């Protein structure tokens, strides 16, 4: 009975509403981040440890697009469970006490979205609520993950209710990004207008150009440096231990084999 | 003399470079 | 039909009446 | 205390902190800050009973136990 | 310019191949995706993208994991070089007399030397039938000269 | 025991930069068709593109008939039609 | 808060000394934690038995 | 580029709500605009 | 639960996520 009542009261209940998923994930991104750095049997247990990391944080995704509590409840119950028992099976650390403690204020945000409840508007990226310099750098930087953009845009497809296919949904997330980076540059401009005419500052171009012609550089010239430095290192002396002569004279039974070693 | 708002400007058009504007 | 309904857009709803 | 010791050592605890007292009606209870107290209490004496060596993070887990306690008994 | 109508050609085929399927077999105004539609296509792209990062991963780790062969002496070959000018004691051992050491001469090896940590670990690290008893032999025959 | 090199290059940094740089590039193809759809909805959004077959079937049978002459007056009108983005929603209406 | 200090000092002078008298002292700090609040106000001059 | 933001906007607020008939109605603008180029000069005007 | 409307829905929906439509 208690029991029931306790979950009953964390499904009904009276609450307020809010999103914390954002700040979900970016726990689990760093636990992601730690692990992949702890791949120090290891290797495959932390290959299977990428998995999961990968998969909850899928699952994670779905449970906040269809707006579960319930499904949150469930997911936070098996998860504290098997990641405690997780640590049973410790036989393959500071890397592991971090990934608990980054995978406790997980849980305990995830207890708060349960406890909470799911607010009406989910949908909308972070890092687009604003129109700075940070959300742009922010956005342009979630861009430049190999398939993070791809993911999110495929996942939320899946789950969000939609009546396009993906190839259309996949168009709206393309033309909202630009247009949101081009946005962010309008609002900049604005912000911190620049004289009509005004040269574009010495500087400035002296960066970025040297930046560019270094990046070029390196594309050729430092690979031959490399090459030809660790190449060139040639040469461990081999002097003979032993002076081995064998005079072998007689053709039937060859012998005269006095000969020395390295104390001669 | 790398001024913070040279510093914004060198980041910002680099980003430029490779992203829109 | 969803193709014929997503393929329907034209020129005059692009024109300024009253965009607030 | 999870992070210092591990087993039966905490292991019941910290589910505990994240299937009951996070996931309730606003305060925890009264029952769950019982039974943490009780738990921790146990633990040492069993510790003490010898694990060999024991050690006692469970001095400061049973005295902010405590604390809390107090804190809520003035509301 | 024969290739611009040829791929000219081509996206308009394929453009008329959908259009014919969908005045074919209409879909409804505003019905959803499917659900199932959306798992299948989904899932197998996130299948595809695991198998970018993660599936390489796992045949590069259990390709290399596999290492481990048994090296066992044949012979016990102790020339005790003694003569400055003529080394020889020469009296030495083979495989017959080589013992390759069973699991419970192993864990006899083991607790002689188990008081000290490294001792041990070094003989228990060690495969069974891997330490190998030089049983080298003494007796002489050969003079010296 | 003997350990026999099942790597190859190198299983710490040889192997595994070889890999990191596959993700990355495999990372770019990915990307090449999520990112600029958007530049193309003029040329595969078209409603009815049975004018544009017509056209193009057209120059197929002037280059069978060797009227060649007309192949290149055909082509014309192609690359007309996809010079201006406008024409080419008037002549891919989905009705008239 | 000195009635506080001495239950920290019961506490540890049991968790040093390894033995019986030392459980005793681990009881009788987990008791006046407890049972304590309200004796540190009402044991201040009524019967500090 | 405001008043292209409002129709991603509006597309992503129907699809809270769920009243997906206007998600494809608003999507057809989307594509529209991004079809016709003159249009999009129109629709992009600094002021109006 | 994978019926064959379904299944040719799925094929040609990856297809158009590829080609064109
Ligand atoms: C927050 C930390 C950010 C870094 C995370 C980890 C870094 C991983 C790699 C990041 C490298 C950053 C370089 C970005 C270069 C911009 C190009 C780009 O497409 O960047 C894309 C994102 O693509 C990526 O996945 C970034 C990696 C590109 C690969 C370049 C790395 C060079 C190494 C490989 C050399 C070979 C190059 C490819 C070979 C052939 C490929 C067909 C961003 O435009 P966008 O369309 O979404 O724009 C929207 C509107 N234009
Ligand atoms: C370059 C796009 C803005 C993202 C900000 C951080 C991305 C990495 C650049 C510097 C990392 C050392
Ligand atoms: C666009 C060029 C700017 C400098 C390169 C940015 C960092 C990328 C790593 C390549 C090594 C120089
Ligand atoms: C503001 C950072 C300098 C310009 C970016 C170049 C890439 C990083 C090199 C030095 C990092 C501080
Ligand atoms: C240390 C030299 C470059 C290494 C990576 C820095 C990336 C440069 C970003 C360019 C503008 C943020
Ligand atoms: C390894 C982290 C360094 C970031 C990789 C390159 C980021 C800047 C390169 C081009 C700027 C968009
Ligand atoms: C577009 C992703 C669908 C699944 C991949 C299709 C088959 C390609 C071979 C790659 C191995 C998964
Ligand atoms: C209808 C075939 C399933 C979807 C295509 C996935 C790639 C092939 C995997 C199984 C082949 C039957
Ligand atoms: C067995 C997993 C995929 C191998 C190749 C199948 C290609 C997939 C085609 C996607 C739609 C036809
Ligand atoms: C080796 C035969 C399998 C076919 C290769 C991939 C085909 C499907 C991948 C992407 C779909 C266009």
Same mark, same amino acid.
């Given at each position: 009975?208690?029991?029931?009542?306790?979950?009953?009261?964390?499904?009904?209940?009276?609450?307020?509403?809010?999103?914390?998923?954002?700040?979900?994930?970016?726990?689990?991104?760093?636990?992601?981040?730690?692990?992949?750095?702890?791949?120090?049997?290891?290797?495959?247990?932390?290959?299977?440890?990428?998995?999961?990391?990968?998969?909850?944080?899928?699952?994670?995704?779905?449970?906040?697009?269809?707006?579960?509590?319930?499904?949150?409840?469930?997911?936070?119950?098996?998860?504290?469970?098997?990641?405690?028992?997780?640590?049973?099976?410790?036989?393959?650390?500071?890397?592991?006490?971090?990934?608990?403690?980054?995978?406790?204020?997980?849980?305990?945000?995830?207890?708060?979205?349960?406890?909470?409840?799911?607010?009406?508007?989910?949908?909308?990226?972070?890092?687009?609520?604003?129109?700075?310099?940070?959300?742009?750098?922010?956005?342009?930087?979630?861009?430049?993950?190999?398939?993070?953009?791809?993911?999110?845009?495929?996942?939320?497809?899946?789950?969000?209710?939609?009546?396009?296919?993906?190839?259309?949904?996949?168009?709206?997330?393309?033309?909202?990004?630009?247009?949101?980076?081009?946005?962010?540059?309008?609002?900049?401009?604005?912000?911190?207008?620049?004289?009509?005419?005004?040269?574009?500052?010495?500087?400035?171009?002296?960066?970025?150009?040297?930046?560019?012609?270094?990046?070029?550089?390196?594309?050729?010239?430092?690979?031959?440096?490399?090459?030809?430095?660790?190449?060139?290192?040639?040469?461990?002396?081999?002097?003979?231990?032993?002076?081995?002569?064998?005079?072998?004279?007689?053709?039937?039974?060859?012998?005269?084999?006095?000969?020395?070693?390295?104390?001669? | 003399?790398?001024?913070?708002?040279?510093?914004?400007?060198?980041?910002?058009?680099?980003?430029?470079?490779?992203?829109?504007? | 039909?969803?193709?014929?309904?997503?393929?329907?857009?034209?020129?005059?709803?692009?024109?300024?009446?009253?965009?607030? | 205390?999870?992070?210092?010791?591990?087993?039966?050592?905490?292991?019941?605890?910290?589910?505990?902190?994240?299937?009951?007292?996070?996931?309730?009606?606003?305060?925890?209870?009264?029952?769950?800050?019982?039974?943490?107290?009780?738990?921790?209490?146990?633990?040492?004496?069993?510790?003490?009973?010898?694990?060999?060596?024991?050690?006692?993070?469970?001095?400061?887990?049973?005295?902010?136990?405590?604390?809390?306690?107090?804190?809520?008994?003035?509301? | 310019?024969?290739?611009?109508?040829?791929?000219?050609?081509?996206?308009?085929?394929?453009?008329?191949?959908?259009?014919?399927?969908?005045?074919?077999?209409?879909?409804?105004?505003?019905?959803?995706?499917?659900?199932?539609?959306?798992?299948?296509?989904?899932?197998?792209?996130?299948?595809?993208?695991?198998?970018?990062?993660?599936?390489?991963?796992?045949?590069?780790?259990?390709?290399?994991?596999?290492?481990?062969?048994?090296?066992?002496?044949?012979?016990? $070959?102790? $020339?005790?070089?003694?003569?400055?000018?003529?080394?020889?004691? $020469?009296?030495?051992?083979?495989?017959?007399?080589?013992?390759?050491? $069973?699991?419970?001469?192993?864990?006899?090896?083991?607790?002689?030397?188990?008081?000290?940590?490294?001792?041990?670990?070094?003989?228990?690290?060690?495969?069974?039938?891997?330490?190998?008893?030089?049983?080298?032999?003494?007796?002489?025959?050969?003079?010296?000269? | 025991?003997?350990?026999?090199?099942?790597?190859?290059?190198?299983?710490?940094?040889?192997?595994?930069?070889?890999?990191?740089?596959?993700?990355?590039?495999?990372?770019?193809?990915?990307?090449?068709?999520?990112?600029?759809?958007?530049?193309?909805?003029?040329?595969?959004?078209?409603?009815?593109?049975?004018?544009?077959?017509?056209?193009?079937?057209?120059?197929?049978?002037?280059?069978?008939?060797?009227?060649?002459?007309?192949?290149?007056?055909?082509?014309?009108?192609?690359?007309?039609?996809?010079?201006?983005?406008?024409?080419?929603?008037?002549?891919?209406?989905?009705?008239? | 808060?000195?009635?506080?200090?001495?239950?920290?000092?019961?506490?540890?002078?049991?968790?040093?000394?390894?033995?019986?008298?030392?459980?005793?002292?681990?009881?009788?700090?987990?008791?006046?934690?407890?049972?304590?609040?309200?004796?540190?106000?009402?044991?201040?001059?009524?019967?500090?038995?």
């Amino acid at each position: 009975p208690l029991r029931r009542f306790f979950h009953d009261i964390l499904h009904t209940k009276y609450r307020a509403a809010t999103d914390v998923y954002a700040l979900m994930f970016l726990a689990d991104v760093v636990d992601f981040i730690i692990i992949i750095f702890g791949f120090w049997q290891v290797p495959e247990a932390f290959l299977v440890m990428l998995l999961i990391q990968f998969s909850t944080m899928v699952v994670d995704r779905a449970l906040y697009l269809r707006k579960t509590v319930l499904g949150k409840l469930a997911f936070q119950v098996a998860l504290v469970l098997a990641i405690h028992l997780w640590m049973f099976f410790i036989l393959p650390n500071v890397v592991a006490q971090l990934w608990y403690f980054v995978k406790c204020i997980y849980f305990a945000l995830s207890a708060y979205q349960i406890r909470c409840g799911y607010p009406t508007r989910i949908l909308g990226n972070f890092l687009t609520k604003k129109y700075n310099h940070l959300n742009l750098f922010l956005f342009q930087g979630f861009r430049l993950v190999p398939f993070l953009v791809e993911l999110r845009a495929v996942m939320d497809w899946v789950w969000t209710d939609t009546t396009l296919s993906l190839s259309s949904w996949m168009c709206v997330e393309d033309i909202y990004a630009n247009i949101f980076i081009i946005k962010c540059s309008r609002e900049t401009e604005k912000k911190y207008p620049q004289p009509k005419g005004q040269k574009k500052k010495k500087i400035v171009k002296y960066g970025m150009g040297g930046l560019i012609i270094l990046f070029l550089i390196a594309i050729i010239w430092f690979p031959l440096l490399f090459m030809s430095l660790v190449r060139s290192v040639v040469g461990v002396v081999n002097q003979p231990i032993d002076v081995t002569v064998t005079l072998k004279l007689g053709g039937y039974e060859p012998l005269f084999t006095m000969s020395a070693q390295q104390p001669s | 003399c790398c001024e913070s708002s040279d510093c914004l400007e060198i980041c910002m058009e680099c980003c430029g470079i490779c992203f829109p504007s | 039909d969803h193709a014929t309904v997503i393929h329907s857009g034209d020129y005059f709803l692009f024109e300024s009446d009253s965009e607030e | 205390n999870h992070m210092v010791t591990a087993s039966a050592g905490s292991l019941v605890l910290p589910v505990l902190v994240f299937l009951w007292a996070m996931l309730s009606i606003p305060r925890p209870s009264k029952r769950f800050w019982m039974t943490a107290i009780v738990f921790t209490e146990i633990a040492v004496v069993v510790k003490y009973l010898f694990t060999d060596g024991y050690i006692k993070y469970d001095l400061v887990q049973l005295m902010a136990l405590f604390f809390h306690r107090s804190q809520l008994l003035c509301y | 310019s024969w290739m611009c109508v040829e791929d000219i050609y081509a996206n308009i085929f394929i453009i008329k191949c959908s259009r014919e399927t969908e005045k074919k077999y209409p879909q409804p105004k505003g019905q959803k995706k499917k659900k199932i539609v959306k798992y299948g296509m989904g899932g197998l792209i996130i299948l595809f993208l695991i198998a970018i990062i993660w599936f390489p991963l796992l045949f590069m780790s259990l390709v290399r994991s596999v290492v481990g062969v048994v090296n066992q002496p044949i012979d016990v $070959t102790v $020339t005790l070089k003694l003569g400055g000018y003529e080394p020889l004691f $020469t009296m030495s051992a083979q495989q017959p007399s080589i013992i390759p050491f $069973t699991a419970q001469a192993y864990e006899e090896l083991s607790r002689q030397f188990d008081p000290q940590p490294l001792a041990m670990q070094f003989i228990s690290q060690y495969s069974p039938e891997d330490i190998v008893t030089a049983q080298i032999e003494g007796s002489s025959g050969a003079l010296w000269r | 025991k003997v350990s026999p090199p099942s790597l190859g290059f190198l299983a710490g940094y040889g192997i595994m930069g070889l890999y990191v740089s596959i993700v990355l590039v495999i990372g770019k193809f990915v990307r090449g068709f999520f990112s600029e759809i958007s530049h193309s909805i003029m040329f595969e959004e078209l409603p009815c593109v049975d004018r544009i077959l017509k056209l193009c079937q057209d120059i197929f049978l002037v280059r069978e008939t060797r009227e060649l002459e007309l192949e290149e007056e055909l082509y014309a009108k192609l690359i007309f039609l996809y010079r201006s983005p406008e024409t080419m929603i008037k002549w891919t209406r989905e009705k008239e | 808060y000195l009635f506080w200090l001495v239950l920290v000092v019961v506490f540890v002078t049991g968790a040093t000394r390894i033995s019986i008298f030392g459980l005793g002292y681990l009881l009788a700090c987990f008791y006046l934690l407890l049972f304590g609040t309200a004796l540190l106000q009402r044991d201040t001059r009524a019967r500090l038995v």
